[PDB]
Amino acid sequence: KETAAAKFERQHMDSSTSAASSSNYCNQMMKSRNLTKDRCKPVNTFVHESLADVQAVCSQKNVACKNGQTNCYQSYSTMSITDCRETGSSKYPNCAYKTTQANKHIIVACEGNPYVPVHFDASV
């Protein structure tokens, strides 16, 4: 089955673009990354950075996750991110999202050897 690390990349990484280029970015990416296949994922963040730069966060500032786990890390630097959240009209299978671009620090949970992101916790 898909590993947690691979799931993180599919759900949260977009090294192919430097920022969201239009209001339809989230609609298209949520679909393309299969985040709308079985239900409309309510909220999601994409990170417009290299994979290595995001993986490196696992060696940056430790902080407890929202759920209390202690394997979370905040990036030292801000990153280009896109916030995706369902619009009021979103209704499966016609999932619909508001695209918001931002430059924020990220907080990720990490696991494994290599020690890599497995969950996106927050943009801050």
Descriptive labels:
alpha+beta; four-stranded antiparallel β-sheet; 3 helices; three-stranded antiparallel β-sheet; 124 residues; monomer; P-30 Protein
Strand content is 25-35%
Count of discrete alpha- or pi-helical segments spanning 4 or more residues:
3
CATH class: Alpha Beta
CATH superfamily: Ribonuclease A-like domain
CATH architecture level-2 label: Roll
Through-space gap between termini: 31 Å
Q: What is the helix content?
A: 10-25%
Q: Tell me the count of domains.
A: 1
What's the short story on this structure?
This protein has 124 residues and is of the alpha+beta class. It contains 3 helices and 7 strands; from the N terminus they run ααβαββββββ. It is globular, with a radius of gyration of 14 Å.
Can you walk through the features of this model?
GO terms for molecular function: lyase activity; nucleic acid binding; ribonuclease A activity; RNA nuclease activity. With about 120 residues, this protein is an alpha+beta fold. It has one domain (about 1-124): Ribonuclease A-like domain (P-30 Protein, Roll). The protein is about 20% helix and about 35% strand. It contains three helices and seven strands, in the order ααβαββββββ. Strands 2-3-6-7 form a four-stranded antiparallel beta sheet. It has a three-stranded antiparallel beta sheet with strand order 1-4-5, covered by helices on one side. A hairpin with a 4-residue loop joins strand 6 (about 105-110) and strand 7. The longest helix is centred in the first third of the chain and has 9 residues, at about 5-10. The radius of gyration is 14 Å and the shape is globular. The relative contact order is 0.25.
